[PDB]
Amino acid sequence: KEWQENKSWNAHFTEHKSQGVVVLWNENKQQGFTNNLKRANQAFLPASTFKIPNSLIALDLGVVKDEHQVFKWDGQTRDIATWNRDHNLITAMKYSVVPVYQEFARQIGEARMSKMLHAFDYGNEDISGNVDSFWLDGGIRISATEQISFLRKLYHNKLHVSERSQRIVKQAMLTEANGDYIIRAKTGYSTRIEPKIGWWVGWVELDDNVWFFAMNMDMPTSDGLGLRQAITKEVLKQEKIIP
Amino acid sequence: KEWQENKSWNAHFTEHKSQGVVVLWNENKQQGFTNNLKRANQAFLPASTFKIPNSLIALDLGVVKDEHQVFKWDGQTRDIATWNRDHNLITAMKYSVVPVYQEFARQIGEARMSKMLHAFDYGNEDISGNVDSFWLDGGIRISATEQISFLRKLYHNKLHVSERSQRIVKQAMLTEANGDYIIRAKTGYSTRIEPKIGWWVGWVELDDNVWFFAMNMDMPTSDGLGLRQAITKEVLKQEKIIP
Ligand SMILES: [Ca+2]
Ligand SMILES: [Ca+2]
Ligand SMILES: [Ca+2]
Ligand SMILES: [Cl-]
Ligand SMILES: [Cl-]
Ligand SMILES: [Cl-]
Ligand SMILES: [Cl-]
């Protein structure tokens, strides 16, 4: 789908002692750009970026009624403090609350989960593993360019779910908005299976164009997680997509 | 419904050599707050804050198909340069493009416009004047507290239009988003009939509450337009609603 490699983006990885790939897609021009054509097509566990298709399926099936429905904390104190409270869809996305989404997956069930991922053509369409963790330590794999293809369908309401489900998930993906741009996006952190990597996928809305992006990077410890957004935003600024 | 006057907010107006009102509504507690109970109930022309009901009606009637439909420039060079180009619903809201919305109102028509504003309980529901300018120089009036009453219905999808129309307009109202809050809002600047006033109405979404707001202020010249948001934010910061 015509692709250009820009190795100069590696400066932002090197200056932060990191390795990874950033993939950009110019929607108006139907042109992609990446610092690493090979890693752009390498498929990894999605980790919490799977909250995007999981939210879509839970909404379309009515497992989740709307973005205000409250999911009560199950009482177990977990390591991440923001998880130990009640949540709705907006806040569960914001704080990447895995237990809420594992509950969704159990209710969806393997049969409907598999049919939906085949309908979405999501990654390798493989949900081998535990129904409540296959996106963390099971068989599903998705590349950065495959994230882009999925996200473009979601942006255009072209996925095989209701228009309403897609609108709600795109609301819950809202990450940043100002007078220059809007970012809708989701992070992920894959630690259970090598290689440990961090994800950021989503898009930048401008007045007259949309730039889709998907990045992943090596993440040996959780102390580099903020580099997912930092390095992406530095690539977007280098390309004059955002000020 | 339990109102409290806080005259210490007047300092933010006087600091800026200005006069006006800010009205806040705590949705969880169902309590309102204002620096001026009398001006909070004073009805003014809505000017471009009327883009919120106008968008809702145009979408519900199919005058606007979706937020991507392009409204071509009519080739009239107007004083605000950002108006002299093609727009969609998102950019027409962002740049407050009056002529796009005047065309909406002509296509809606007098009969359907009057019926819909009655259905919304919007202000005084009076559309006396030109069908394509009554919110700028006709008979419609709305107070800051009435703006909040209307906005609360929109937030809850309770207005008598489709859920889809309400979701699209709330998307188009997106003004600011970060890791702490989301602001959905619309500015207005009424100059055709005295007194000249500026508006800012909308809400702040937090993790666990929603704060609705409506402000207007005297605006003799366009030089103070930035004070509409700046003074509201100074009040929100004083009240610890935003960091
Ligand atoms: Ca850099
Ligand atoms: Ca496939
Ligand atoms: Ca102040
Ligand atoms: Cl998850
Ligand atoms: Cl207007
Ligand atoms: Cl009501
Ligand atoms: Cl939104």
Swiss-Prot record, chains A, B:
It catalyses: a beta-lactam + H2O = a substituted beta-amino acid. Induction: Expressed from an upstream promoter, P(out), in an insertion sequence IS1999. It comes from Klebsiella pneumoniae. The active site is at 48 (acyl-ester intermediate). GO terms for molecular function: beta-lactamase activity; penicillin binding. SUPFAM superfamilies: beta-lactamase/transpeptidase-like. InterPro entries: Bact_Transpept/Beta-Lactamase, Beta-lactam/transpept-like, Beta-lactam_class-D_AS, PCN-bd_Tpept. Inhibited by avibactam, related diazabicyclooctane (DBO) derivatives and by bicyclic boronic acids, via a covalent binding to Ser-48. Inhibited by chloride, bromide and iodide ions. Not inhibited by the beta-lactamase-blocking agents, clavulanic acid or tazobactam. GO terms for biological process: antibiotic catabolic process; cell wall organization; response to antibiotic. When OXA-48 is present in clinical isolates of K.pneumoniae, increasing chloride concentration during antibiotic treatment reduces bacterial growth. A beta-lactam binds at residues 48, 51, 96, 228. Monomer. Dimer. The keyword Signal applies. Class D beta-lactamase which confers resistance to the beta-lactam antibiotics, including amoxicillin, and moderate resistance to cephalosporins and carbapenems such as cephalothin and imipenem; in the DH10B strain of E.coli. Acts via hydrolysis of the beta-lactam ring. Has oxacillin-, cephalothin- and imipenem-hydrolyzing activities. Its EC number is 3.5.2.6. Keywords: Antibiotic resistance, Hydrolase, Plasmid, Signal. It comes from the Bacteria. Changing residue 48 to A: Does not alter thermal stability. This is Beta-lactamase OXA-48. The modification N6-carboxylysine is found at residue 51. Belongs to the class-D beta-lactamase family. Carboxylated on the epsilon-amino group of a lysine, with the resulting carbamate functional group serving as a general base. Probably N-carboxylated at Lys-51 at neutral pH in vivo and undergoes complete N-decarboxylation, at pH 4.1, in vitro.
